[PDB]
UniProtKB/Swiss-Prot annotation, chains A, B, C, D, E, F:
EC numbers, comma separated: 3.6.1.1
Pfam families from the UniProt entry: Pyrophosphatase
Subcellular location: Cytoplasm
Entry-linked InterPro entries: Pyrophosphatase, Pyrophosphatase_sf
Organism: Escherichia coli (strain K12)
Cysteine pairings via disulfide bonds: none
Residues binding substrate: K29, R43, Y55, Y141
Descriptive protein name: Inorganic pyrophosphatase
C-alpha cells in the first residue's frame, strides 16, 4: 500500500514524495490516513485559494509536529493523488501555526524523471514569483478557518531542508 | 486499504463514505471490488447522464441487497474516486429495481470538513431541484441497459436514512 | 458583437452580464476591450487565488471609475468567457482600491434560466461562506501586484446594488 | 462575426455548423443571439444529462420552427462554443415538441478535416449505441422543465437530412 | 491491493487490465510498483505526445522483458489511474526497443461493460487512423529521451495477442 | 471583432498575439477565418501530439506565405481560443514545408501581464527542453497528413524574430 513506500532511494538528496493534493486543483485538502492508507477529505477550504504546487509527504519520517515531513513538488503537469514521485530537496519555508513551528519543503523532480529541474540546485534558484506565491498561500489559506492559523517566517536553503529530512527520518526509525 | 476504513466515527449521525464515482464526471460506473479493494469498471453507461452528486458506500455495512449501503454526497467540488469523506445523513430515496427494493441515501459533508451544509438538517432542507434531479437520474440512467431497471418510489427523512445505516451495520457485524 | 448586447431586458431587476472570467478557473484575469470587443489578458495573477464566481460586467453602463458595472454571478457550472447571462441583482460588496471606491455586485441567474436561485432575494440570503470567500478574495488577490491594492469595506443590499446599476446606466446614456 | 459565416461551401453535402454546446460538457444550454452574434445562456438544465455530441446550427437557414437548422456533430474531441466546423450530413432524428415538429440532424466532420468519419455514409452507418443515446437525450432532457416537452418520432436518412437543409436554405434566401 | 487482481476471468479471451495512464492525459508516464502496489512517476515526457488510449498491464503475467503484458484499451471516456477494466484482446503491435522485442496489445472493453466494441473482433476491425496513431506514438514518444528508443515493426492479429497473454500467464505461474 | 485588434502597441518589441489553439489542449487545429473573424476547425489531427504552447498570430501582418506571422506563447496556464495576449518576441524556429519556408516565433507574456518571463531576453534563455519539444512537434505533427510536411531547420534569435515581425507588418501595410 502507500504505507510501504520508502522515504527515498538515498536520503536526503534522493527522496520519494507521496502526493495528497495535485497542483492546479480544486480547494479540497486531502490527507492519507496512517491506519488505512486511504485518502481522506480533511477540509473543503473556505478560501478561494489553491495549493501552488503538488503537495504531500515523505513516508517513514516523523517531524516534531507528529506528522511526516510536508513537501511541495513543482511539476510540468499536475500529479495524481496517491501517486509517488522521486524528487530532490532544494529549500524550505519555515512558519508558525496554532500548534508550533512547521516547515514546508520544496523538492523538484529527480533528474531521472526529467532534466527540467536540474538547474534548480538551491533555494535561490527557485523563481521569485513561485516562492512569493507559496508564502502567500500558506499565510492566507486558513484565514477563514477558526482555530487554525499560520504566520510565515521565511525561506531557508537546501541544506536546511535536508537536515529536516534526516532528523525526521531518524526520529521515525527510532520511534 | 479501502477495505479497513470504518463505517463511521459515531454511526448513524457521523459516517464515512468511500467514493466510487465523482460528481460532474464522465458516465463510467466504477465499483470497489470486495476482494481486492481495487476500483473496477462496472459499466460504460449507454445514456447521456451523469451521477448528480459524488456516489459511493458505507464500509462495513450489509444491506438486504447483499451490498454495502449506497450514498450520494453533495460537495462544492468533485471528489477523487477511492477517497473517503466524513458525512452526516439527511435523507433517503427509495426505489425498486430488477432485484427488489433499494435505497440511495443522501449525506452531507460533516461540519468539521466545512460549515457549508450545516443548515441541511433533514430531507426537506435539500434543494427541491437537487432532489428532483437525483430521482430523475435513478429513474432513467438504466433505460438503455437490458436486464437492469429502476422505478423510483419516493423520498424519506433523515431518521429513515439513519435506520438503514444502523440496520445494515448490525447485519454486517453479525454476518 | 459583445459591444451591442443590452444592459438588460428590464433594468435594474432583469439584467445581462457579459462574462469575462469563469468560475473555478485558472488565475488569468481577462477583460473585454472596449474598441474591438475582443477578450484580452489583463494579468497572469501572482497569487494562488481564483475568482469565486463567474465575473464580468453590465454592458452600456458607466460607473464613476470609468468602467462598466462589475458583477459576480454564481452558477451551478462555470460559464464560457464571452458568453452572456440573464441575471437578477441581490447585493453588492463595497471596497476601496488605489483609484478610489469600487463595488462588486452579486447577481443570480434569472428565474427563466433556472429556478435554482429564486430563493435568494437579498444579500442576507446569500450563503455566509460565499460572502466571506468573495470578500477575502478581493481583499487579497492583489497582495503581490505592486501598484494595485484593495481594502474591502462591506456588503450592502439588493436596493444598493440596483441603485448602482441605474446610476451607471443613466450615466452611460447621457455620456 | 458568426452572423456572416456561410451555410456551407456546397450545400447540402458540404456544410458549416456553428457550434453552441460542446460534447462532454456541463449541462448549460447556450444559444447564439441573432441580433448580436453573442453566445447567451438559455438554460441551466435541471436534468443530469449532457448533449451527446457537439450541438449547433447551420447559418443562413430558416426552418418552419423559425430557427436555423439544428445539427449534432460527433467529433474525436469536444469543440469550442462559437467555433465553426465543416461537415457532411448523414441522418436526421425527427421529433415533436410543445411547438410542433422538429428535427435534429447528424453531420460528421468533412473528409478534409479528417478521414475518421468517411466510412459513415448514411444513417445506418452511425453506431446503434450513439443513435439510441441521442434519441434518449432528446426524449428526456426537458423532463423537469415545465412548458417544454419532446416526443421522439424516429430516424430518417441522409437524403431526408439534405432535404431539410435545402428547404431551409431556400426559405431563408427568400425571406 | 492492485497486486491481487486476477489476470482475467477466462484468459486469454476475457482479461483484466490495470490502468496506469488514462487516455487524453498529460504526458506523465506512471507505473505501478511491484512491491508496494503504488503508482509511481516514471517519467515526465519530453515530447509533446500523449498516450492514444488508456494504457496498463495484465496482472499475474510475465513477458520475456521481465514485466507484465502491456495493453492499450480504447474507451469512450478516459479511465482512472489504478482502476481495472474487463476487456477482450483484438490485436498486437510488435516493436523493438533498446532492450529487445516488445509488444503492445490492444484490448477492447468487454461486452458486459458495453456493447460498443463488440463489432471489433480482430485487428482489421480497429480503425485505420487509430492503428496509425498508436504506431506513430510508440515510434516517436522516446525521441527526446537518451538511452531509450523504439522501432515499430508491425501489427499482428487477435490470435497473436492471445498467444502472448497465455505464454506470459504460464511463465508467471511457473516462475 | 478579432479582425480589428492592433499588431501591437509598439512593434516589434511589444506585440499582440491572437490565440487560436491553447496550450495543453486536445489535438484540434483551429484557425481564425479572415473574412468572418470566426474560429474554424482546420483539422482534427491524426497524430497523438499537442501544441506545446498557446499558438496564434499577429494581426495586421503578412508573411511571404500569405498568412499573418505565426507565434507560440508560453504561459503559466492555458489561454482561451480567440483571446489576445500582449507579448515580447524572444526567438524564432525556422522550417521548410510543402509550400516553402516558414517560421514559428516564440513570444513571452509582456512584463505588464506578469514578471514571470522577464528573465527570458533572447533565444538562449528559453529552456532547452521547451525548444527541443517545440522543434520535435513541428517536425512530426504532420507525419500522418498526406500532402502536408515539415522539415525543421533551426532556431534564430530575438533580432531575427523582430525582423520577421517588422517585414511582415510593413508588407501588410503596403498591400
Ligand atoms: Ca483548477
Ligand atoms: Ca501532512
Ligand atoms: Ca501545521
Ligand atoms: Ca509539518
Ligand atoms: Ca496568517
Ligand atoms: Ca463533466
Ligand atoms: Ca454499491
Ligand atoms: Ca440495485
Ligand atoms: Ca443498495
Ligand atoms: Ca425507470
Ligand atoms: Ca480549476
Ligand atoms: Ca471591469
Ligand atoms: Ca478597481
Ligand atoms: Ca468597478
Ligand atoms: Ca488588501
Ligand atoms: Ca464533462
Ligand atoms: Ca437552435
Ligand atoms: Ca424545439
Ligand atoms: Ca429546429
Ligand atoms: Ca419526452
Ligand atoms: Ca488532455
Ligand atoms: Ca509495463
Ligand atoms: Ca520496453
Ligand atoms: Ca512489454
Ligand atoms: Ca523511433
Ligand atoms: Ca490536455
Ligand atoms: Ca497561421
Ligand atoms: Ca506552413
Ligand atoms: Ca507562417
Ligand atoms: Ca517532418
Ligand atoms: Cl524507508
Ligand atoms: Cl506544480
Ligand atoms: Cl536529481
Ligand atoms: Cl466499522
Ligand atoms: Cl456534488
Ligand atoms: Cl455534522
Ligand atoms: Cl442597453
Ligand atoms: Cl459560481
Ligand atoms: Cl428573476
Ligand atoms: Cl450562405
Ligand atoms: Cl462528439
Ligand atoms: Cl466529406
Ligand atoms: Cl490470476
Ligand atoms: Cl481511449
Ligand atoms: Cl467480450
Ligand atoms: Cl495595427
Ligand atoms: Cl504554454
Ligand atoms: Cl516586456
Ligand atoms: Na484561521
Ligand atoms: Na433497462
Ligand atoms: Na498590491
Ligand atoms: Na417538460
Ligand atoms: Na531516445
Ligand atoms: Na505528411
Amino acid at each position: 500500500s502507500l504505507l510501504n513506500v520508502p522515504a527515498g532511494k538515498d536520503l536526503p538528496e534522493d527522496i520519494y514524495v507521496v502526493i495528497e493534493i495535485p497542483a492546479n486543483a480544486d480547494p479540497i485538502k486531502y490527507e492519507i490516513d496512517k491506519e488505512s492508507g486511504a485518502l481522506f477529505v480533511d477540509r473543503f477550504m473556505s478560501t478561494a485559494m489553491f495549493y501552488p504546487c503538488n503537495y504531500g509527504y515523505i513516508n517513514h519520517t516523523l517531524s516534531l509536529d507528529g506528522d511526516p515531513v510536508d513537501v511541495l513538488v513543482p511539476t510540468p503537469y499536475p500529479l495524481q493523488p496517491g501517486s509517488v514521485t522521486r524528487c530532490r530537496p532544494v529549500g524550505v519555508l519555515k512558519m508558525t501555526d496554532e500548534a508550533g513551528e512547521d516547515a514546508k519543503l520544496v523538492a523538484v523532480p529527480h533528474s531521472k524523471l526529467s532534466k527540467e529541474y536540474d538547474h534548480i540546485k538551491d533555494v535561490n534558484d527557485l523563481p521569485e514569483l513561485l516562492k512569493a506565491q507559496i508564502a502567500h498561500f500558506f499565510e492566507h489559506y486558513k484565514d477563514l478557518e477558526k482555530g487554525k492559523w499560520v504566520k510565515v517566517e521565511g525561506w531557508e536553503n537546501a541544506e536546511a531542508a535536508k537536515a529536516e529530512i534526516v532528523a525526521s527520518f531518524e526520529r521515525a526509525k527510532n520511534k
